[PDB]
Amino acid sequence: VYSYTEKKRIRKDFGKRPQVLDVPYLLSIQLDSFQKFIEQDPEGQYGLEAAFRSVFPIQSYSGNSELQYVSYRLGEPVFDVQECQIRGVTYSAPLRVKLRLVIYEREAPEGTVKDIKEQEVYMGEIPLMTDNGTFVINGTERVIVSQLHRSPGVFFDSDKGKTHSSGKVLYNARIIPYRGSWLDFEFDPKDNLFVRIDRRRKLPATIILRALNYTTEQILDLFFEKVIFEIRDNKLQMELVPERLRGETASFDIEANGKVYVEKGRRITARHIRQLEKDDVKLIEVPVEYIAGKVVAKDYIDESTGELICAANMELSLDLLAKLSQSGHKRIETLFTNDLDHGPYISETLRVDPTNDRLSALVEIYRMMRPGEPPTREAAESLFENLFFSEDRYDLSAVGRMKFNRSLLREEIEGSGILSKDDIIDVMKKLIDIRNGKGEVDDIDHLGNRRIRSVGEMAENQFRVGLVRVERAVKERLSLGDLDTLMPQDMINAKPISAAVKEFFGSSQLSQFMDQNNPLSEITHKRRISALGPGGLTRERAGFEVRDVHPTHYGRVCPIETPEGPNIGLINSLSVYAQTNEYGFLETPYRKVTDGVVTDEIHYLSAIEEGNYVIAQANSNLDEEGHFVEDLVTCRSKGESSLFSRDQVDYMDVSTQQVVSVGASLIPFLEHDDANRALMGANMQRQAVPTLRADKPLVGTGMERAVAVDSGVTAVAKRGGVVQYVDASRIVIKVNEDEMYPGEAGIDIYNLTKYTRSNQNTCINQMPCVSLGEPVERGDVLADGPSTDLGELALGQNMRVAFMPWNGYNFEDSILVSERVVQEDRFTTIHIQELACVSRDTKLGPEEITADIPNVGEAALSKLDESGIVYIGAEVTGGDILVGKVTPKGETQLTPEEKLLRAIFGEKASDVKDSSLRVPNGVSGTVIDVQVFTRDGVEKDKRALEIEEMQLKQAKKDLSEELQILEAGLFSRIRAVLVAGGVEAEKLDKLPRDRWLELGLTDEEKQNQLEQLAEQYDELKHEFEKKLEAKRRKITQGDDLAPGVLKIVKVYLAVKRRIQPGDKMAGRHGNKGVISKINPIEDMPYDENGTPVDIVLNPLGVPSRMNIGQILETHLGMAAKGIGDKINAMLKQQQEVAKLREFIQRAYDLGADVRQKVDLSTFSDEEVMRLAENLRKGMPIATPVFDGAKEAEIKELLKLGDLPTSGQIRLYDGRTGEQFERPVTVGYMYMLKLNHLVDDKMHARSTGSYSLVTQQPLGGKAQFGGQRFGEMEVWALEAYGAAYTLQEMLTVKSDDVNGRTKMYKNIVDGNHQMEPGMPESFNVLLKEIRSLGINIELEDE
Amino acid sequence: SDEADEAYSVTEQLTMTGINRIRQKINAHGIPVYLCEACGNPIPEARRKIFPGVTLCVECQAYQERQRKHYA
Amino acid sequence: GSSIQVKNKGSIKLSNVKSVVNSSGKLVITSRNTELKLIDEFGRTKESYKVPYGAVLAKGDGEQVAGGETVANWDPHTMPVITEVSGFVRFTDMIDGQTITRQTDELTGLSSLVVLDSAERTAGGKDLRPALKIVDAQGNDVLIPGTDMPAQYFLPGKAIVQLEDGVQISSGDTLARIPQKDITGGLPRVADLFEARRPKEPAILAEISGIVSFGKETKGKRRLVITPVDGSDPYEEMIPKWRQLNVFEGERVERGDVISDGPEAPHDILRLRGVHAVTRYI
Ligand SMILES: [Zn+2]
């Protein structure tokens, strides 16, 4: 059940699993986040409404001067997108707010209002989001990478080991809020427990308990369990709770009933506790020595005196037992301490507690928060209440409360805003229990502690900071507040908020240039998480902790796609099915499980909600109904993974792909690659430059179509219909009768984007693929972009590789590319460089853009027209002129004998200095397009007038073609008027269309309908008169250029770089390479049938770097081209549709269980010929990533062709014509072309420009300056005895500004001497030391 | 050499040293002990027969392992 | 990660003392951590030797040995398998191709069923355990003292056997015989070499060649005392007694021989032995 578009070539699809969650729209992060940002949102939640409800209303100094909020608006831009890339504006959208300045009357708190002046005030231009989540800030398409930062809540950290040298670990616990004072708990190595408010001094941690209305009795009964001792007529009985005695010294005879069930000295093993439980002991009679070290909880005083016998939390010695014996107590309370489990911590910290009771504790808090402030009753009350208990001065965000209740094993995920007695006490219990053995510590990386921002929330915060810095000014201008003379816009300033928001979108560690050199690059750049930036941890502070992968990445961030090198792991790329949760933490799909069934309901899980479940594994064969095939299946429960019984799973992975990203899920046979290698593979697939004829992955992974379509490059049909008029520019879809709106149907039209620059200087082209008179279904591609083909992402080209050494040309990783790959121009990649030539305004005068140039005859000026700009199309080369420009330079200041010379030949020395924009030395191109911006203070020249006329012709053509469709829709609606009630069918197609307004009709509601539709027609008329007026006026106006520039002339060269020894190349699995000798055809190897193997890689790179996936891909490719050549023979020897059907059907079934059966008996006889003609280059093959095609499937798919099952053909060398012993592997591997081109990298500099502060080399153009002869190189030269080369390496070649010119004079005059002198850098050092008062001089002898 | 080759060497180093630590722990050589090195209880047959020459009863082992779980 | 040749005269002593009287009366050592103390007649220690496991002895507590009686013996590679209980023997689970193999010594004349390891056996005796089970005269296993747990001796692979079935056994009888530093080698070990950082516990080394004794007793640091041939004697130095001495009260040591142990810091060697010595250390 396929469409008519999908049948262009139906990708053979292995992969055994059924997909149950189709791939989400890959750009959900950017789009949905910026959608939450900018929208009138009738609820106080996120969006701009959040910021405005936060900072407004502004009340003055209580003076009945208020400025409140009403509602805002997003006026449409003045320049739309492509206009805004041409000209250079920020694709903004002017903001508007309805602020409402109210002024209450004095002698009135809320008495009668005296003025409510309601006026709408401008502020800022928020740069809107394109349809592809890519803003346009200054002409270039920029992208704001999602950030990943610590969620405000609670954290229990270790800081294990190194401190204190005893090895003993500390267990600190931090309560970070959204906004307010922190709170920390920590152990000392002496094991007492201490607190600290915001990172200030430590404190005896019981002081905060006491400050919260806790005296020692209830402290000890919160942080401890009770053991009562009894004095029942003889010597110190004890309560026996049976499980109190696991792992403890038996320092006494544990008898019972006068029977000995446990004996002294031993240890109470589980046997003993078992037997005491079975033998029912409850009150054991132990000696006094065992109470001698116990601790007494409650307070005891002589009941006859009221004098304090034992304070709370004192150790009972024998004397105190005696003393309270004579007071009439048979109950005694003792803390159940223990070295293992119920440790003494709060008790011994009370030992450390200097203070005694509540008021003293509040005093100490007041003296630790701020010194010098004398303590006080109410000062202490206010300070302590306002640390953690002030709704104004402290608020966990609701995210804060949610983490704080999920990390305590609480109940409600949402609740209060400030802390409480119970929140603090639960923190402390959790802390002590962490240290007691039960419980564990949340390591940093755990994605339950990495809330994900994105464009929306970050821009919201920047607008927030803007609002605070402006409400300062608002309250200030309200200080002087005249009641009714300042409207609600002189209080504000617009440029503040615009400054903040532009600073974010244009200067950030996030808002960065789109890696727009390959559709996979954009859609793997917009899906991106970053841990750097403002508010995240940067490298120095942190640090190795967050580089790591952590088992909560399984389906939430890709593990095998992260930028290797300087910052690994800080650029985690988001998974395939991942999402941002409601609160923010990354979440992912999982299929629900009933009693024992695998439901098809996908259910989302965040990070903190997972471990309490037990998730199955997607690689589980299930039994045609939703029951597993076994009773025990692999699963993963809490980090660990293991076998579980069938009746225990709760969640199955949505699909085998979800562990990866869109980066590494395109690598076919990813499953057989060492993870570093898939890392480098994805990170070299993000850089493939779009070739000239982008072919297709001959072996793909299923996700490639979704990446091509969901990225913006393909030209996706908005509505299904017939194709009326294709063309290299535009595609005209005639919408069908059912997908067609009721009024003014019309037809959809797509203006493609022909040749044009992207940021990385490549060609972002679009070519139609659906030809004239041809159906298209909704949601289908019309026009392939760069590196797409038929809507299947084709980054590089497939080609014939043969693994074999072949004379050292591929030594380390080098590659040997036969000239059949470069003759065809199949890696010939097109690069569209932009050269600008401004025309500035110096003190001497304005630069000219004349065609009149000195010291260059007609020679270099043959390509220039009458005005100094080159023609569109002249094939400039290295060193020619594109824009003739001359600057007036007075004071020629003639010299000696040069003056004699001018006398000798009378040649008038000109007043003008040539500065024309000449092509960079080396490129060789075609000037595809010249644009001339002009300050509107200059008379536009002749060529700019040509350009204005031409663009205006174009825009007139376009907008008139638009008006035609529109009026056709309105005539349609007119017929829809007549069709009901008195339509005259054939009396309306004969006569002219324009004379339908005067068509007869009875004066019912339908005559008034005709009148109304005539009104609509004339409105459209005047509308497009005035709209073409506005188009002509946008074109005709001057530009608004930088300060002091007359006119800029942009010239778009279009180089075509082919391929040449040095151009890096690479497969997908991470086999790099540097194509190293572009061999003839004859020389290459050739299999017994004749075909020369185009590339020749190296065998020594498959075992050493375990990326055997490239050998399996090579074999699947060889089988694929086997099928291809079989269809080619069946089609060239032209057979029929019948043989083709039987053979393609044999290819598409092919054995093992698959989810792809197509049944070509429904393809019409003429579709299968088209299907063949698209397969005649070779049958594509899918292979979902961790669910690929196992080897034996490949072997049978080879045997379906006629290749040898071994995969290894016997090759004959091309030069000697004699068989390679030991057959080689040959196949069709898909190889990219990385854009580390050679001619971008090559560089050489003999005498260029120079610096200005130190006479060193400095060039610009391609760092047109010498290589850095750094320090380690100087160590090298000193290691050799060579010292002359060093002396000239930093005296003659580099700095000594007489040494270098004398060296050049000597070199030209054929005397290789050198006259060093002394470096100008050291002379600067003498001056910089001497400006300080340090007289450094050089002795002279 | 490449940047993944060096990472392979480091991964070999890391897992080899970890595994060889944990094989250094387990004894596999008899020194028949017959009752604890701390508590004195008899070590049962099954435990002394799995791990030959193990000085400590089961409970003493769990207890020392738990005091060491907080890393000394 | 091959016997104690006593040299001097004096009484004998053991600390951490534990051993068993073998059938030959030799008070053969079962304990590991016992140490032998060669005492002079003063009542103070002369020399010390850390007891080998299952070593052979002749002398005992508080008795004079003279220089030359090699009392403390130990088989240099073999790990003795002595047994304290008194009884007879049977062999259970020692089967050809399964746990042991048929192994005949031709130089002794008796066969030794040297226990075969986890890689030398097949599925017929894979999980099986070579068990030397002690018995009484009845054929019942002699209980070991202090357990309701019989006496059957476990033998890992590679263990050469002393005697076969039918052999009576008693204490101090090795049934079996099994054969017999942290060199942090990163780069940061090399940086910390050239930086010459003083280690954690400096291997305490002498000052001068001369006789010794012990002085002021542990006001924190117990004090060593060093007096020359005849010269500048007054040096007596603090020493954390929290780590062992490898010296005795009456030794005339050469300067530059370890009193204690540990990675000796380089400053010590340079000031004590000579520059050649320290450069060879590094
Ligand atoms: Zn024990």
JSON list of N, CA and C and ligand atoms in Angstrom, two decimals, chain A residues 267, chain B residues 36-41 55-61, ligand 1:
[
{"chain": "A", "resi": 267, "resn": "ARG", "atom": "N", "xyz": [30.07, -13.19, 68.13]},
{"chain": "A", "resi": 267, "resn": "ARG", "atom": "CA", "xyz": [29.27, -12.21, 67.40]},
{"chain": "A", "resi": 267, "resn": "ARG", "atom": "C", "xyz": [27.87, -12.76, 67.15]},
{"chain": "B", "resi": 36, "resn": "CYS", "atom": "N", "xyz": [36.75, -17.99, 62.15]},
{"chain": "B", "resi": 36, "resn": "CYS", "atom": "CA", "xyz": [36.97, -16.63, 61.70]},
{"chain": "B", "resi": 36, "resn": "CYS", "atom": "C", "xyz": [38.33, -16.09, 62.10]},
{"chain": "B", "resi": 37, "resn": "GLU", "atom": "N", "xyz": [38.75, -15.05, 61.41]},
{"chain": "B", "resi": 37, "resn": "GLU", "atom": "CA", "xyz": [39.90, -14.26, 61.81]},
{"chain": "B", "resi": 37, "resn": "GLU", "atom": "C", "xyz": [39.52, -13.19, 62.82]},
{"chain": "B", "resi": 38, "resn": "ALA", "atom": "N", "xyz": [38.23, -12.90, 62.97]},
{"chain": "B", "resi": 38, "resn": "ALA", "atom": "CA", "xyz": [37.77, -11.98, 64.00]},
{"chain": "B", "resi": 38, "resn": "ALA", "atom": "C", "xyz": [36.84, -12.64, 65.01]},
{"chain": "B", "resi": 39, "resn": "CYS", "atom": "N", "xyz": [35.72, -13.20, 64.57]},
{"chain": "B", "resi": 39, "resn": "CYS", "atom": "CA", "xyz": [34.66, -13.57, 65.50]},
{"chain": "B", "resi": 39, "resn": "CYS", "atom": "C", "xyz": [34.84, -14.94, 66.11]},
{"chain": "B", "resi": 40, "resn": "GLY", "atom": "N", "xyz": [35.48, -15.87, 65.41]},
{"chain": "B", "resi": 40, "resn": "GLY", "atom": "CA", "xyz": [35.70, -17.19, 65.95]},
{"chain": "B", "resi": 40, "resn": "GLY", "atom": "C", "xyz": [34.71, -18.24, 65.51]},
{"chain": "B", "resi": 41, "resn": "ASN", "atom": "N", "xyz": [33.57, -17.85, 64.96]},
{"chain": "B", "resi": 41, "resn": "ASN", "atom": "CA", "xyz": [32.58, -18.81, 64.49]},
{"chain": "B", "resi": 41, "resn": "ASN", "atom": "C", "xyz": [33.18, -19.77, 63.49]},
{"chain": "B", "resi": 55, "resn": "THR", "atom": "N", "xyz": [39.51, -16.16, 55.52]},
{"chain": "B", "resi": 55, "resn": "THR", "atom": "CA", "xyz": [39.76, -16.11, 56.96]},
{"chain": "B", "resi": 55, "resn": "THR", "atom": "C", "xyz": [38.49, -15.85, 57.76]},
{"chain": "B", "resi": 56, "resn": "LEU", "atom": "N", "xyz": [37.46, -15.33, 57.12]},
{"chain": "B", "resi": 56, "resn": "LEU", "atom": "CA", "xyz": [36.38, -14.66, 57.83]},
{"chain": "B", "resi": 56, "resn": "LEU", "atom": "C", "xyz": [35.05, -15.35, 57.57]},
{"chain": "B", "resi": 57, "resn": "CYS", "atom": "N", "xyz": [34.19, -15.41, 58.59]},
{"chain": "B", "resi": 57, "resn": "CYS", "atom": "CA", "xyz": [32.85, -15.96, 58.42]},
{"chain": "B", "resi": 57, "resn": "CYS", "atom": "C", "xyz": [32.06, -15.06, 57.48]},
{"chain": "B", "resi": 58, "resn": "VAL", "atom": "N", "xyz": [30.81, -15.42, 57.19]},
{"chain": "B", "resi": 58, "resn": "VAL", "atom": "CA", "xyz": [30.05, -14.62, 56.24]},
{"chain": "B", "resi": 58, "resn": "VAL", "atom": "C", "xyz": [29.69, -13.27, 56.85]},
{"chain": "B", "resi": 59, "resn": "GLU", "atom": "N", "xyz": [29.24, -13.27, 58.10]},
{"chain": "B", "resi": 59, "resn": "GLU", "atom": "CA", "xyz": [28.78, -12.03, 58.71]},
{"chain": "B", "resi": 59, "resn": "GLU", "atom": "C", "xyz": [29.93, -11.07, 58.90]},
{"chain": "B", "resi": 60, "resn": "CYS", "atom": "N", "xyz": [31.07, -11.56, 59.38]},
{"chain": "B", "resi": 60, "resn": "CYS", "atom": "CA", "xyz": [32.22, -10.68, 59.52]},
{"chain": "B", "resi": 60, "resn": "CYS", "atom": "C", "xyz": [32.63, -10.12, 58.18]},
{"chain": "B", "resi": 61, "resn": "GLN", "atom": "N", "xyz": [32.48, -10.90, 57.11]},
{"chain": "B", "resi": 61, "resn": "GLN", "atom": "CA", "xyz": [32.85, -10.37, 55.81]},
{"chain": "B", "resi": 61, "resn": "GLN", "atom": "C", "xyz": [31.91, -9.26, 55.39]},
{"chain": "D", "resi": 1, "resn": "ZN", "atom": "ZN", "xyz": [33.67, -14.09, 61.57]}
]
